[PDB]
Design a protein around this ligand. Structure first.
Ligand SMILES: COc1ccc(C2=NNC(=O)/C2=N/Nc2ccc(Cl)cc2)cc1OC
Length: 336
């Protein structure tokens, strides 16, 4: 139940806070507009009446038979690199009231691509590092996103802040439980998914992140193809034919990129984009990679003088996979 009034058309809903105790809130918003569509449902941009603050409203069809998995997952998440679930309410449709983020890596990468240019490496570092942090965080709960792609990576152009969104495919992966191989989008799918594996791990997200990194470096997807076969061919052309052992596990890099591509960017890709799922860097190990060393420099600034967003406020939860990595991850200047 919602109420409509005119101050300008105003919608007043009684919504449940995304986190904390269930204390219903009256939320009034106006100036709604569609910012995105998809198979899930629609995404709107709305303005909160009282604060003038912009929010995004993701509205999806609600199955009465079960609780929404995306909602349940998002209610438990609290990270600087994950879009925040402020409130949720019903219309049946589930409406997720999230923080509003102006851009996506997809649109940004496309602006550059169309202009035959490349995103400055400083932004590639900042975006990728933040993506790996969000993954280290979700994976620490055993949650695999399963659909990492530029359209699911939100970004604030001015603050250089990246936020992971779209938890509609996300799932807690439990050893011994099979999972569907038909998740994950064309050009971002790990080879084990292409091969039809149901015993895959969270490392599928690392492969997808490597595809995004390579795409930001190249200006186009690194493994295109409209079919699995075409995708595998593109993969084989770079990684070489997988060995019999590599197939069982799944169940020239320097020449790939433009001349002045930093060697550390290339090395990072080669460690993300590996056939053997267990051989891939974990997100936290990716964060600690030397390609991100510039971000740990005490004098680093955004091109426009502004400060970099928060990068070292790691929690114990976040570091749980490998606590000693805090040694690299938290630079001396961040330890006061
Ligand atoms: C489900 O897909 C989502 C899409 C957008 C957002 C989103 N949250 N907060 C925002 O600001 C969002 N913005 N989305 C968006 C979409 C398109 C453009 Cl071009 C810009 C922003 C969140 C989603 O999942 C929860």
């Amino acid at each position: 139940s919602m109420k409509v009034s005119r101050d300008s058309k105003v919608t007043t809903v009684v919504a449940t806070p995304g986190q904390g105790p269930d204390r219903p809130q009256e939320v009034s918003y106006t100036d709604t507009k569609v910012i995105g569509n998809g198979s899930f449902g629609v995404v709107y941009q709305a303005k909160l009446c009282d604060s003038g603050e912009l929010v995004a409203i993701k509205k999806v069809l609600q199955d009465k038979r079960f609780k929404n998995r995306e909602l349940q997952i998002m209610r438990k998440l609290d990270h600087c690199n994950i879009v925040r679930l402020r409130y949720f309410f019903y219309s049946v449709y589930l409406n997720l009231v999230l923080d509003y983020v102006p851009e996506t890596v997809y649109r940004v990468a496309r602006h550059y691509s169309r202009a035959k240019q490349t995103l400055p490496v400083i932004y590639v570092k900042l975006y990728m590092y933040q993506l790996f942090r969000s993954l280290a965080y979700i994976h620490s709960f055993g949650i695999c996103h399963r659909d990492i792609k530029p359209q699911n990576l939100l970004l604030d152009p001015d603050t250089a802040v990246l936020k992971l969104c779209d938890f509609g495919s996300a799932k807690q992966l439990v050893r011994g439980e099979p999972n569907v191989s038909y998740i994950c989008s064309r050009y971002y799918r790990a080879p084990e998914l292409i091969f039809g594996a149901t015993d895959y791990t969270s490392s599928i997200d690392v492969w997808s992140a490597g595809c995004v990194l390579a795409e930001l470096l190249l200006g186009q997807p690194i493994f295109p193809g409209d079919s699995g076969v075409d995708q595998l061919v593109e993969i084989i052309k770079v990684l070489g034919t997988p060995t019999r052992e590599q197939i069982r596990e799944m169940n020239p890099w320097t020449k790939v990129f433009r001349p002045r591509t930093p060697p550390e960017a290339i090395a990072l890709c080669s460690r993300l984009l590996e056939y053997t799922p267990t051989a891939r860097l974990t997100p936290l190990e990716a964060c600690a990679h030397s390609f991100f060393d510039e971000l740990r420099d005490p004098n680093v600034k955004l091109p426009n003088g502004r400060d970099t967003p928060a990068l070292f406020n790691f929690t114990t939860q976040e570091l749980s996979s490998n606590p000693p990595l805090a040694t690299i991850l938290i630079p001396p200047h961040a330890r006061i």
